[PDB]
Structure formats: C-alpha cells, structure tokens
C-alpha cells in the first residue's frame, strides 16, 4: 500500500531510471509495473503474483 498504490505482487529490484518528479510506473496495457519507495529513493518493480 505504498502511498495509495494498493496492489499485490512480487516487489523486485530493477535498473529503471526514474525522473525526479515521476513517482509511479506503467506499461503498454495500463498496468502498474514499477513504484518508488517514499522512504528511500530507490527503484522497485512490481510484478504479477505467481
């Protein structure tokens, strides 16, 4: 539940370059696939569950 982003999945470590103002991520099919931790400025990758 990262700052309103309510979703389930496998949070992994991705080498994605996020802009300073960009917080959320998405893809072609309009699905959240990357989030930013509001505590430490790291890059996460929400992936669908198994």
């Amino acid at each position: 539940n990262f700052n309103g982003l309510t979703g389930t999945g496998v949070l992994t470590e991705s080498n994605k370059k996020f802009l300073p103002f960009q917080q959320f991520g998405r893809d072609i099919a309009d699905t959240t696939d990357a989030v930013r931790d509001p505590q430490t400025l790291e890059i996460l990758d929400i992936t669908p569950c198994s």
């Binding site: 103002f21 960009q22 917080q23 959320f24 991520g25 998405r26």
Partner: peptide
C-alpha cells in the same frame, strides 16, 4: 507582433 510555435509547448500530463 506574431510568431510561430513550431513544436514547443508540450509537457508531462501525469506523474507516471
């Protein structure tokens, strides 16, 4: 006077 805005005036619509 007047000018022409060729391809400028585009911003990021959302925060994604």
């Amino acid at each position: 006077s007047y000018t022409n805005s060729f391809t400028r005036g585009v911003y990021y619509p959302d925060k994604v």
